[PDB]
Structures are given as structure tokens and as C-alpha cells.
Amino acid sequence: TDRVVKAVPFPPSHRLTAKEVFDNDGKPRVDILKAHLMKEGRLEESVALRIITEGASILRQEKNLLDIDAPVTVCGDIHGQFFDLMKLFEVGGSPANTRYLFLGDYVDRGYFSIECVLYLWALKILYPKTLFLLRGNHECRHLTEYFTFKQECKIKYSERVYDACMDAFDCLPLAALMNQQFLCVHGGLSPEINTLDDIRKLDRFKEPPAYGPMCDILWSDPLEDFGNEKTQEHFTHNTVRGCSYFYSYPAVCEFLQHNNLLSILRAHEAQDAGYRMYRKSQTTGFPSLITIFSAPNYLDVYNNKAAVLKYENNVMNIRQFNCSPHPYWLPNFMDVFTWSLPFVGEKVTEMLVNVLN
Amino acid sequence: YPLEMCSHFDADEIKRLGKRFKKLDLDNSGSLSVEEFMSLPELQQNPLVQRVIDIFDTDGNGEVDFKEFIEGVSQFSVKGDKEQKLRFAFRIYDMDKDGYISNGELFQVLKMMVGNNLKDTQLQQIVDKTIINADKDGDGRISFEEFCAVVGGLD
Amino acid sequence: KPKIIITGCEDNVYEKLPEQNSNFLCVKKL
Ligand SMILES: [Ca+2]
Ligand SMILES: [Ca+2]
Ligand SMILES: [Ca+2]
Ligand SMILES: [Ca+2]
């Protein structure tokens, strides 16, 4: 051909068929999927829909509050950074022999969100009892229409795939109880979540409301000065998010104490080191809160490390990792004709107006 | 043919266009060279000038004679229809004039427009994906109908 | 009570978008 730059791969145009993606027994061929998606290859739409809906069916049978025992690798926000998700599994261990808990935010910001969803859903189908996925605040209609996931689905697949994802996201569990020690959630606590039963009783099968316990689980944050508070308001309006709350160190410690838990593991906030351990509880001598953030060099500019938390043999091993190369996209997945045509029009008009004076 | 029959222009318009052509033809050769266009400061930082000249130059001799000039500017008459504008836009990208936009042409023409605003590797990636999404018949190039399907609604 | 252990990594290495010259076709800022 006359293609100028061979220093980058040319993505495959072939869309993988059901026969190529699923073995005779209905098992996803995750190695083929990984390789094809890493090449920016697409699936046939019907195949993508099958992965999403089969995953949803499994998620739908799970409880709001999962029980997950160690050993397990716990992961925070991914935000569509598919090429970093690939490194994440190398750092955390192969899902074929490693239990996983993801704390949500699979989509938005990164422009490989649908690849993240398809691959994780395929892994869920293959490893339904060892790979676990929680809901984050981005796994909803409201945020995905504001950010880029809906457009991503439109350009790569169609709104049918988007809608399937929205239903699947409604099915995502909200929390895990890990080793009967750790409450794991995307965001944090709620003034309406005082025991674990308060999570168990929720109806999660919906778009998250703008208020209430389900909202708070996905949306809340620790105070900026968590552990060094000047007042003792347990929950205050979250002026950063515009909804839900900031929770205080006394709020967390009282909850942990009451429910005989060791710590809260959550995600939802970028961390330069990929993690943050907050002040030890006065009743456990262990950090009251840990944030895990699994998206290295977030937005391609934060220059943060990512981390996962591997809990095994009574050791919590925080494993940091750095970013991996990924392909380029114009903002909002704009094609180069749509991008350049206005400039063409402006410059050609410019030229001729001046030629004709 | 009289030029008003080869364009959207009437005789009055042709005469005015003639007066501007003469002013631009510095050596009275009867043709405009690229250098003669570039003598206009306003065309200075304009990456499209080369492409427009090439499109106007229908006999491919590297210069624009008066008939080529008239027929070229005609493609921007207010009296030209939507299809003519889409055809001109397509011609911006179709460097070798074979009626298809190839991968290499799309890259080269965008590179003229973007300069160093994107690395070659970045530009190649977005060219590739534009073609994969727009190429309905799988020949790895973009036909006029494939192009229009992408940009037809932009107006 | 679990033991905490941090495992480190190297710094990020990545390409930055070129500065956008407004005389040419630009990528809109995100
Ligand atoms: Ca001349
Ligand atoms: Ca000529
Ligand atoms: Ca061509
Ligand atoms: Ca084609």
C-alpha cells in the first residue's frame, strides 16, 4: 500500500465471531480476546452483546455484599486504561489462579473503556467464583453520557452495546466483606449505613439515585484532613462531588468498632503513589482507611503510580506499577475528516477571499 | 466554450476575475505559478494553498491558466450546490486524483494541515481508525460515497 | 493483624502531546 508510518501497528478490521471467541462449551477464549483487543480489534456486535449479557446474568445472582476470602488481589479505578489493565494482571497474578476484587470505575476518561468491560466480563464468565467486580460511580447512565463511554460505544459498536452495559452495571454488587475483616466499597460510608445489614437490604438494581445509601457507597470521600479534624461532624456535604458526603476519621472508627471490622478499603480518588493508608484506628492499631487507585499516569498527565493490594498469608502487599503505551485517539473519538474539514473550509475560504480581494 | 458556460459566472464576473488574474500574473506568462500565489502575504501561513492550486491545475502542468482559474474559483460560487462543495472537499484529500482517498494521501494531507501538532505515529493511528470505520467495502481506501457518509451532515 | 509491605516500581515513561500551534490544525484541549 502507500501507508506512510509502519512504526505503529495497523489494527485488524475483522470482527471476531462467536466461533472465534467462545469454545464449544461456551467458555470465552480470553487469550484470543486479550490479543485482539490489545490490537484495537473489535468483536461482532452480537458477540459483544453476548459477553455483556452473560456476565450480567452472573452478576445478577450475586449478593449486594460479597463474601471474598484471601488470598485476593484488590484493585481500584481503571477508567478505561485497557493497556494498564494488562499490566495490572501481570502485577496482581493471573486470574486463572488468583482471586480478584475490583472496586469499580471501569469506564470513562480512558478511551478503551469498552475493551476493559468486555475483557473483565469475559473473565467473570470464565472465573465466576474467583473474579469479582463492584460498582463504581461511573458505572451508570448519568456519568457515561456526560463523559465519553456512551460515545465510545456509539463509534466502536452501537448504542445497543451501551444499553447492555447499563443493564449489566445495574447488576454490579455494591460491596465486599473480605476475610471477615475488611469492608470494600468504591467510595465509602454513609450516614445511613451503620451496619453491614444496611448494605444487604438495599435494592441495587437501578441507576444510582442522587441521594441516599446507594449513592453514598459509590460517591463519598474521606475529608481532606481525615485524621486531623478540627470539628467532629461525622458526615458533611461533599462540596467536591456536589452530592453525598465527606466522612471523618471518627465516623470511620466508630463504624469499624461497632461492626468489628479492621479497615475500609476503597478507591474513587487518584493517588500519586497509587495508594494511601490513613490514620490508624484507636481500637485496632491498623489504618482505618485505605485508598487504592489502579490507573497509572491518569488522564495521560497525572504522572501517578498505580497500585493493587494483594492480601495473602496475613500480609497486605501493596504493589505499585507504572503506565504502559497506548494508541492515540482524537478527543471524543472524532474521525480525521470531521476534525479537519472545518479547518479546510476556513483556509480555502481565506485563500480565495484574498486571491480575489 | 465561453467561460460563463463552464462556470457559475456571468460575463461581468468573468471580466472582473480577469482583472484580478492579470494582477497576480507577475510575468505576463498567462499562467499563475505557485510562487505568484505566494507573493500574497495573506496566503503565507496557509497549508491548504498547495492543495487548492493542485486541484485548480486540471491539466497538471503545475500552473493555473485563466480557464483553470475561473473553473477553480467557480467551485466556491454561492450558486454551487452541496454536491459540488462535497466534491471539492474530497479533492482536497485525493492527491493523485484517482477518485479514492488512500491511507497515504489522508496522512500526507492531514500532515500538511497539522504540521508538528501531532507526531507521525499519533497521526497514523487516527488515520488508520478513521479508514477502518469509514471503509464499507474493505478495499482500504475511501470512496466519494464513503466520504460523504462521514461528513455529509456537517454542512 | 496483617503485616503491611510496599513493593515499588520504576517511574512512568510516556509521550506528551505536542504544544498546539494555532496556525495549524489543532487538537482541542480536553
Ligand atoms: Ca505567470
Ligand atoms: Ca495548468
Ligand atoms: Ca487517490
Ligand atoms: Ca472503500
Numbering used by the authors:
A (entry chain A): 14 to 370
B (entry chain B): 6 to 160
C (entry chain C): 205 to 234
Pull verbatim passages from the article behind this deposition:
In contrast to PP1 and PP2A, whose catalytic subunits combine with different regulatory subunits to create a suite of distinct holoenzymes, CN is always composed of a catalytic A subunit (CNA), bound to a regulatory B subunit (CNB) that binds four Ca2+ ions. By dephosphorylating a variety of protein substrates in response to Ca2+ signals, CN regulates development, learning and memory, cardiac function, and the immune response. Here, we describe the first high-resolution structure of CN bound to a physiological binding partner: the protein inhibitor A238L from African swine fever virus (ASFV), a highly virulent double-stranded DNA virus that infects domestic pigs in Africa and Europe.
CNA residues 1–13, CNB residues 1–5/161–170, and A238L residues 200–204/235–239 were not visible in the electron density map and thus were not modeled. A238L binds CN in a largely extended conformation, stretching from the PxIxIT binding site to the CNA/CNB interface and then looping back along the CNA/B interface to occupy the newly identified LxVP binding pocket. The interaction of A238L with CNA at the PxIxIT binding pocket buries 886 Å2 of SASA and is mediated by A238L residues 206–211 (PKIIIT, the PxIxIT motif from A238L), which form a short β-strand that hydrogen bonds with β14 of CNA to extend one of its central β-sheets. Leu229A238L, which becomes 92% buried upon complex formation, makes hydrophobic contacts with residues from both CNA and CNB subunits: Trp352CNA and Phe356CNA, which, when mutated, alter binding to the LxVP sequence from NFATc1, as well as Leu115CNB, Met118CNB, and Val119CNB (left). Similarly, Val231A238L becomes 97% buried when bound to CN, forming hydrophobic interactions with Tyr341CNA, Leu343CNA, Pro344CNA, Trp352CNA, and Leu123CNB (right). Notably, Phe228A238L, which is immediately N-terminal to the LxVP binding motif, also contributes to CN binding, fitting into a deep pocket formed by the loops connecting EF-hands 1 and 2 and EF-hands 3 and 4 of CNB.
